[PDB]
Write a protein that binds this ligand. Structure first.
Ligand code: MG
Ligand code: ZN
Ligand code: ZN
Ligand code: ZN
Lengths: 97, 112, 87, 107, 180, 275, 550, 171
């Protein structure tokens, strides 16, 4: 069934932070990708079982993180990339507030 | 004094149908349309051309066009808008998400 | 920075617990109880994790602490024990 | 302050910023007939000293940005001769509290 | 790669290339082994290097304190040193850590100064030299005779000290040299 | 409406901000109260003849026909002529008068019925029932018990907590209107002649006002961006319009609201109203 | 993902937007895309070393990924590249590429207007990233000569040399996907080569472009022109491969093959016997395809039609809201643990209840963790089976392996273990989100208490008819089932019907007594209206919290 | 060399351990994950120092599951070898290609060619050795090697070293 933008509005109104995440992830397209701590893309060749992670053209075999995002977000990121846009994802803050 | 006239009109559109909306609701919308020293429209042109998140703004009206400039101007989305977390499948800093929860080993050992 | 932590003396937030905090402490504790975490209250024949957590909360035997962040990032840590539950 | 009747030639206008620290103001005689500040809807605006402002930002954990803004050209900002940066405190009546105080930073 | 260990040095590495440099005793140690280190108290602390002799007393002490703590919760000389250190390890170590048993046997078989008293006085002597912590370590770790033996094995020194001065220090070191 | 307000929340500093941390309101709804905990109540000191105000609020222990009769309170007999106590009732009425002038500055038309946070009428009602108050026997309250008790209640009605002038003077402003209503409904003449409250009844009424007020304040995390948006957006959908089927015929409802939000320069019905 | 990864689990705290330096695209690439083919080379109906190819990801349910050797569910996909025979303008920047040319000297790469100008100092002052580029352009557009010398701040009589050549500048106009200048008897008219536009941008000073809208690290103007075109892995363009003999490649696969075909024509044409005014024909074709892959719904140009007469879905078109990724796949989603049926009014339901039909309750489940409290009851639900009402559908062992209670040979002798989860049926009094679209209210979605009943309708209390806006005129509603002991707490402790009773919309209550009850309450509460004992006693019994005092 | 570094591992604890011996369980899981462990950044983390005062800090309860993440700030003794670092060590293995020396936790290998010309392999010896006019290098001999360069691997740091230069050789 649909948990549309409007269905999201109400949840935000309710302050039901956890139920919204649950609905948007665990209940539909939650997914696990590997980020590069340097270049911030899903470039990581993740051979998990051999415990091998590498971002060639970064020589990054250390700075690797796993993140949980919707598959549509992953798709969107790969879609933005196909149009030469880099949606770099970083797990640490720079600017502050 | 422009704010005053704005609320007055917004109120008289709602009160024409007889219906009642508590001050604060129309007041907020009016306050929002105004804090940026002048009349900020509730359009694709107005609020959507703010300094707010890149992903946040793209979530309405210009989308691809917003994200194209996002790359060409090297924008850095703060990830504090509701939208951003909704897109990133993360718990938004909304109500139940506006604070953090910690276990104090001290109080824990105190109970047992 | 660790100037981010606001000290116990000089704390401005409500001495009362937010409707959202209650819902989240109750939930968080229920989920933990539910995944066989140690229970600090005498469960008087109790079996539902939410009810057990509500029993934990009424007795104020919940070992959690609310980090209330401010618009700048600075926070006030309040304990479940020290928060008034008027709600 | 200069109270001109109809117009000031663009040649004369060149001389306005020409002599700092002194600041020159241009006011049309026709606009001044009615005091806008006096109107029903226009609340009381109060210029804040460098200290008054510093304290405000410190007490609300604010950046100059985070503050609600007012245009340098705002009828009340011209009236009070607000320069950029200068914060104004606005006191209006409220239907929820009795009084409410907002602040507006210049632009 | 895995859930690994962080440090107190702050990485600013945003996109920028892996421009990392060489590691030689031209005292170009890592960025992770810089002279100007940052302790867990957030303050700038100078790098800590250890002579085998000094290092053995550190591990032996910390492993001794762990035994003490493990027995607290439990409620509610030469080759004979090798015998004993292996008993402390059988107790406080995870066994799987062969590296520490390998290390404790090396340090025990290569310590220049055995007792605490000595090591501290060695440290006191090399303190004054003002030399880099790695050179100071190497001098305590490696036994030399000629000022050249030293200045050759520790090339980092070179001009940093007089020949005679470093040769006087080396004589003081051989005197302090424990008779196992 | 909703996409323009998503990110607006009440932060733990009682301030209204967005995803930039930019201040919109300085306390949610200029009062810092949760919309849900409000009811229309009337401000009695606003309307009526100055004569009727006098009759309903003035206590004068220095005039034989303007004191509280001992039928009202136990001290009634000994209370007459107390100059030191009349100083309290003088300062009390002098503030009550100040209230009336202020309210008339705010609600210029003389509209008394405004939505406020504590239903004081019901608190007093429930007190009378709770304590089986007899409107016959004299009260055990002192003039200090009331005057000084109501003064001390006002200090415990906190919206904003902060040890500095900016926040404290902001607290004073948030509770400005509510307190008018308090002084209005808890004046000495009223508490003794109207509601025939005991020491018990009154102290209970006070604790209840305090605790009921403290309930009524907004909850940091209150996602008021969306709240407000939907609270304008849903009544908008229930609109018939355009402007009946025929004073002036101004374009109203759904089309006029479209006109507002767009901040349209060429509006359908531009009009001036000259007084 | 679904498998254990050693890697640390973090959250995205920042999104850094940038552009791909061709250099990055090469490093990041796992395959140099070479052939506009899909597979079937050397006969074998299996991926070619050109396009798709295992170097990127698997088409088949193979296990082989040949890069991470992980398998379709786990593998995200790996990017490739096509080194382009000539540079092409990125369709989406074409105007900003034009406006940067309108700002800079098309001969030495110098920002046409120096800090020597007072209005330039005013524009350059702007701390804002974009408003700066906007103010700079409005001032630089009207400048048509590169100044070798200019009047100083000291005295205007004795001019100071600011460096840079003295060439005249063209009046730039956009012609489709090309840029044309007009220098100054009779003005000079020539097209501006991507190559030339790129060189000028390469020669733009770091200080210059950072003063323009750009960034030295993530967004250099030169990267707005494409030389290395990244090839998205198969999961972006899925081969919807039906049957053994047939395939069924995605639109984007064709557009890329179209780009690849166009590239090789140009690559061979320029290398071999170049007629030169035919090279500018095949170049314009590669410039079209690369622009039209990213945007097909271009301002006054022919839509790049697919064989069928279909327009070809551009990547822009994919994310373009209401149904694009953003609005339709991210702000909104279709979700598991959801139900929808016709709603019927019920007077015998408590306000905050929701009559769930048995069939629906036997379909939707809840992951209860096997704990000493429930172990006893849960084994009996597992026992009951997935067909009896208070039953269970799956037992999920710690080993992350699903037991289908409908088929498992052990379905009868499962001995539960603490920690394992029992995905049991929704039973009475589980909190659930009930909803009636359009959702223009906090009230349009409320938390209700399940009450498993017979008959195919959702039964709701009539006084809650009002905030939902529901009629029984054939009206239908949604139900969502929370799966965490945490999200149940969210619903129960924040969005339950009893809580929502008094709305903050109008500081009044949003539910009251309606219709039959309203009509009947007037009739009951009258001076005339009196009741004989027989019925008084029944009326008293009907009130459940009756004191038992006549 | 042999440094003392201020490091910090992050651990996620499942709710079942939110009992009183929590700091006790937490300190142990640190020692499990960190002791013995070899990196590249720091190399061999051999022994965790000051067990009684390990800084646990407050544990943030994760959002969808009840587990809590703590940053365990600590101090430890580390071995990070380098090029140029002249090390004393004992021979472990010996072949036609050269001899390997054990130095603390890690092995250093000496190539036949990174040895003086006068020293030469002898297959016909139990155990095999490298013999020179003067000294003989075998399975248990103490050597002073100059580490020529390192190779970091999973749980190891290997290195190649020379005894060709002066004051380098048998001890
Ligand atoms: Mg209908
Ligand atoms: Zn990378
Ligand atoms: Zn792969
Ligand atoms: Zn030039």
């Amino acid at each position: 069934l649909r948990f549309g933008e409007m269905e999201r509005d109400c949840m935000i109104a309710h302050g039901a932070a956890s139920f919204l995440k649950e609905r948007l992830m665990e209940a539909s397209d939650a997914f696990r990708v590997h980020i590069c701590g340097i270049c911030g893309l899903m470039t990581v060749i993740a051979k998990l079982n051999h415990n091998q992670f590498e971002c060639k053209g970064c020589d990054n075999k250390i700075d690797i993180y796993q993140i949980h995002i919707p598959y549509a977000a992953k798709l969107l990121f790969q879609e933005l990339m196909a149009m030469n846009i880099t949606p770099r994802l970083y797990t640490d803050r720079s600017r502050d507030f | 004094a422009g704010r005053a006239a704005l609320y007055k009109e917004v109120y008289n559109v709602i009160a024409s149908d007889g219906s009642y909306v508590n001050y604060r609701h129309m007041a907020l919308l009016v306050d929002v349309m105004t804090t940026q020293g002048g009349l900020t429209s509730v359009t694709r042109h107005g609020f959507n051309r703010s300094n707010t998140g890149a992903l946040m703004r793209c979530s309405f009206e210009e989308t691809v066009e917003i994200l194209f400039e996002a790359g060409a101007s090297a924008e850095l989305d703060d990830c504090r808008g509701v939208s951003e977390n909704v897109i990133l499948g993360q718990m938004a800093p909304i109500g139940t998400g506006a604070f953090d929860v910690m276990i104090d080993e001290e109080s824990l050992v105190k109970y047992m | 920075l660790k100037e981010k932590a606001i000290p116990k003396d000089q704390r401005a937030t409500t001495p009362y617990m937010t409707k959202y905090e209650r819902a989240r402490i109750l939930g968080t504790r229920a989920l933990q109880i539910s995944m066989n975490a140690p229970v600090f209250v005498d469960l008087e024949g109790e079996t539902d994790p939410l009810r057990i957590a509500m029993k934990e909360l009424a007795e104020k035997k919940i070992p959690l602490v609310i980090r209330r962040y401010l618009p700048d990032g600075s926070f006030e840590d309040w304990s479940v024990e020290e928060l008034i539950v008027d709600l | 302050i200069f109270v001109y009747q109809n117009n000031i030639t663009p040649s004369a206008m060149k001389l306005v910023p020409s002599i700092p620290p002194a600041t020159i103001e241009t006011f049309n005689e026709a606009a001044l007939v009615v005091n806008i500040t006096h109107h029903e809807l226009v609340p009381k605006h109060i210029r804040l000293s460098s200290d008054e402002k510093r304290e405000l930002l410190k007490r609300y954990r604010l950046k100059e940005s985070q503050l609600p803004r007012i245009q340098r050209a705002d009828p009340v900002a011209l009236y009070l001769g607000l320069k950029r940066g200068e914060v104004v405190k606005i006191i209006r009546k409220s239907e929820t509290s009795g009084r409410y105080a907002s602040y507006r930073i210049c632009m | 790669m895995n859930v690994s260990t962080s440090t107190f040095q702050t990485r600013r590495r945003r996109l920028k290339k892996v421009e990392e440099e060489e590691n030689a005793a031209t005292l170009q140690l890592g960025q992770e082994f810089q002279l100007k280190q940052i302790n867990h108290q957030g303050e700038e602390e100078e790098l800590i290097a250890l002579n085998l002799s000094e290092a053995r007393l550190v591990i032996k002490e910390a492993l001794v304190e762990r035994r003490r703590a493990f027995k607290r919760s439990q409620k509610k000389t030469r080759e004979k040193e090798l015998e004993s250190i292996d008993v402390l390890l059988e107790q406080t170590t995870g066994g799987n850590n062969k590296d520490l048993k390998n290390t404790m046997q090396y340090l025990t078989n290569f310590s220049r100064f055995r007792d605490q008293e000595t090591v501290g006085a060695v440290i006191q002597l090399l303190k004054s030299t003002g030399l880099h912590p790695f050179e100071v370590a190497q001098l305590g770790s490696l036994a030399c005779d000629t000022a050249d033996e030293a200045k050759t094995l520790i090339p980092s020194l070179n001009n940093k000290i007089s020949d005679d001065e470093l040769e006087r220090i080396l004589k003081e070191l051989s005197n302090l040299e424990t008779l196992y | 409406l909703v996409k323009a307000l998503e990110d607006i929340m009440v932060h733990y500093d009682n301030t209204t901000r967005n995803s930039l941390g930019n201040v919109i309101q300085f306390i949610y709804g200029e009062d810092g109260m949760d919309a849900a905990h409000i009811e229309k109540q009337s401000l009695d000191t606003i309307g009526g003849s100055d004569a009727a105000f006098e009759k309903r609020y003035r206590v004068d222990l220095l005039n034989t026909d303007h004191t509280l009769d001992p039928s009202l309170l136990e001290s009634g007999s000994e209370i007459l002529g107390d100059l030191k106590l009349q100083v309290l009732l003088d300062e009390e009425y002098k503030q009550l008068v100040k209230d009336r002038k202020f309210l008339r500055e705010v609600f210029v038309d003389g509209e008394a019925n405004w939505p406020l946070p504590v239903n004081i009428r019901r608190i007093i009602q429930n007190a009378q029932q709770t304590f089986h108050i007899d409107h016959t026997k004299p009260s055990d309250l002192t003039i200090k018990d009331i005057v000084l008790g109501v003064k001390d209640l006002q200090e415990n009605l906190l919206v904003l907590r902060g040890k500095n002038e900016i926040i404290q003077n902001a607290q004073r402003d948030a509770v400005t209107l509510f307190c008018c209503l308090l002084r209005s409904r808890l004046a000495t003449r009223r508490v003794l002649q109207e509601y025939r409250l005991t020491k018990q009844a009154f102290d209970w009424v006070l604790s209840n006002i305090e605790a009921q007020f403290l309930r009524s304040v907004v909850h940091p995390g209150e996602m008021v961006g969306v709240l407000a948006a939907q609270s304008i957006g849903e009544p908008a959908t229930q609109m018939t319009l355009n402007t009946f089927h025929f004073s002036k015929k101004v374009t109203s409802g759904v089309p006029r609201l479209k006109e507002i939000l767009n901040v349209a320069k060429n509006m359908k019905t531009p009009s001036l109203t000259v007084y | 993902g679904q498998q254990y990864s050693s890697a640390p689990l973090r959250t995205v705290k920042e999104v850094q937007f940038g552009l791909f330096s061709p250099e990055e695209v090469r490093a990041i690439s796992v395959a140099k895309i070479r052939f506009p083919e899909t597979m079937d080379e050397t006969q074998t109906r299996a991926k070619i070393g050109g396009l798709n190819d295992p170097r990127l990801g698997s088409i088949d349910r193979n296990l082989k990924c040949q890069t991470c050797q992980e398998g379709m569910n786990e593998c995200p996909g790996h990017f490739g590249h096509i080194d382009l025979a000539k540079p092409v303008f990125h369709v989406g920047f074409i105007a900003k590429i034009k406006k940067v040319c309108e700002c800079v000297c098309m001969h030495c790469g110098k920002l046409l207007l120096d800090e020597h100008n007072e209005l330039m100092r005013q524009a350059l002052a702007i701390k804002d990233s974009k408003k700066r580029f906007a103010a700079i352009w409005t001032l630089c557009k009207t400048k048509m000569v590169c100044e070798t010398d200019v009047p100083s701040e000291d005295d205007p009589t004795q001019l100071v040399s600011r460096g840079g050549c003295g060439n005249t500048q063209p009046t730039i106009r956009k012609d489709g996907l090309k840029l044309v200048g007009s220098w100054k008897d009779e003005p000079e008219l020539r097209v501006l080569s991507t190559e030339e536009i790129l060189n000028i941008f390469k020669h733009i000073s770091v200080k210059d472009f950072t003063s323009l809208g750009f960034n030295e690290v993530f967004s250099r103007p030169e990267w707005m022109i494409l030389t290395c075109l990244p090839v998205p892995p198969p999961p972006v363009r899925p081969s919807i491969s039906f049957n053994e003999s047939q395939r069924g490649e995605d639109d984007l696969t064709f557009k890329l093959a179209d780009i690849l075909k166009a590239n090789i024509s140009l690559e061979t044409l320029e290398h071999n016997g170049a007629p030169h005014h035919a090279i500018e024909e095949a170049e314009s074709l590669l410039q079209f395809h690369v622009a039209t892959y990213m945007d097909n719904d271009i301002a006054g140009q022919p839509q790049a039609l697919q064989k069928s007469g279909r327009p070809v879905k551009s990547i822009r078109a994919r994310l373009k809201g209401k149904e694009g990724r953003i609005r339709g796949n991210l702000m909104g989603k279709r979700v598991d643990f959801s139900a929808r049926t016709v709603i019927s009014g019920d007077p015998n339901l408590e306000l905050d209840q929701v009559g769930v039909p048995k069939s629906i309750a036997k379909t939707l489940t809840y992951p209860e963790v096997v704990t000493p409290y429930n172990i006893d009851r849960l084994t009996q639900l597992v026992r009951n089976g997935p067909n009896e009402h208070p039953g269970a559908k799956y037992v999920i062992r710690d080993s992350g392996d699903r037991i289908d209670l409908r088929y498992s040979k052990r379905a009868g002798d499962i001995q539960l273990q603490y920690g394992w989860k029992v995905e049991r049926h929704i039973m009475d009094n589980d909190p659930v989100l009930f909803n009636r679209q359009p959702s223009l209210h906090k009230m349009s979605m409320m938390a209700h208490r399940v009450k498993v009943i017979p008959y195919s309708t959702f039964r709701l209390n009539l006084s809650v008819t009002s905030p939902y806006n529901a009629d029984f005129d054939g009206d239908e509603m949604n139900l969502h089932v929370p799966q965490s002991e945490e999200t149940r707490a969210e619903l129960s402790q924040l969005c339950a019907v009893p809580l929502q009773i008094v709305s903050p919309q109008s500081n009044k209550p949003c539910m009251g007594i309606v219709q039959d009850t309203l009509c009947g309450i007037r009739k009951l509460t009258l001076r005339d209206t009196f009741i004989e004992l027989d019925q008084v006693l029944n009326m008293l019994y009907w009130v459940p919290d009756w004191d038992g005092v006549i | 060399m042999f440094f003392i570094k201020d490091l910090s591992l992050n651990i996620t604890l499942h709710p079942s351990f939110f009992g009183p011996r929590m700091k006790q369980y937490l300190k142990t899981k640190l020692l499990e994950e960190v002791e013995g462990s070899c990196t590249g950044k720091f190399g061999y983390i051999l022994c965790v120092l000051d067990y009684d005062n390990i800084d646990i800090q407050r544990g943030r309860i994760l959002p969808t599951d009840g587990s809590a993440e703590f940053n365990v700030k600590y101090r430890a003794v580390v071995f990070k070898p380098f090029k140029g670092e002249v090390v004393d060590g004992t021979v472990v293995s010996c072949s036609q290609h050269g001899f390997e020396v054990q130095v603390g936790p890690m092995k250093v290998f000496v190539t036949k060619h990174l040895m003086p010309q006068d020293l030469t392999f002898n297959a016909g010896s139990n155990p095999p050795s490298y013999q020179s006019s003067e000294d003989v290098i075998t399975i248990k001999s103490r050597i002073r090697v100059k580490i020529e360069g390192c190779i970091s691997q999973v749980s190891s740091i290997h290195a190649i070293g020379s005894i060709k230069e002066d004051y380098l050789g048998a001890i």
